[PDB]
Amino acid sequence: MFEARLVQGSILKKVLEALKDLINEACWDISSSGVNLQSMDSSHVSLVQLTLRSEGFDTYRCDRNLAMGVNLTSMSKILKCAGNEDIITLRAEDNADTLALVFEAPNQEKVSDYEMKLMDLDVEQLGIPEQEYSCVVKMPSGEFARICRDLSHIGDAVVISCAKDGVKFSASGELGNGNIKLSQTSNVDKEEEAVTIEMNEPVQLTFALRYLNFFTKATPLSSTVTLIMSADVPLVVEYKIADMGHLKYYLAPKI
């Protein structure tokens, strides 16, 4: 039996809005530790891994390790029927063919109960090694979304170059080219408004702006985004879900 209760229901709402367009189907792995999801998109160029720790839920219970095959389009439909201040509880039986999502309003006068069919999946799951990377930039999530959105109008691919001082994004298309250059914030007040760069080696990498713009749908989960780069290997885009976990997006590079 699995039972998890979340007073900040909007969190799960955001999570599925962050996922549903990139991935149609995913496996949800339930344990005593919490919820983990990992999935490649249909083209296999990108990868998502979600982690929600059991200490983040108001109450959490897991008897058996559980693997639920879920249509993400469907889970999103269900969660769009929740208000942002609903208390959301997830629940499954030991032999559950469905997952139960129960939404509670703050007046005890409205309660919604939804029941989702699970599905058989034949997934392709990956081994994600812990490396250390040559470059880590941390910046406003909103700034990053803006950049990816704007430059996508210029050309298909963005070139990201890390230096000690700051970071540069560049794209090219039929019309010409653009360079957006962010320096390290020199006078630092608030964490999330700042641009901070920590680097061992200069990185220069090329990515598809198409995919990044899926990623930036996660922007409402956090004020900040962290970008992790190493030469010729997938980029990692990380959003912290505060004091509960994270969504990490990986992106296969162009050469």
Binding site: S43, G69, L121, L126
Partner: peptide, 18 residues
């Protein structure tokens, strides 16, 4: 040329039954 994630990481297949 655009690489895929399997160019970097090993791939186990998995069967979920629901």
């Amino acid at each position: 040329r655009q690489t895929s994630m399997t160019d970097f990481y090993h791939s186990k297949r998995r069967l979920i039954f629901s």
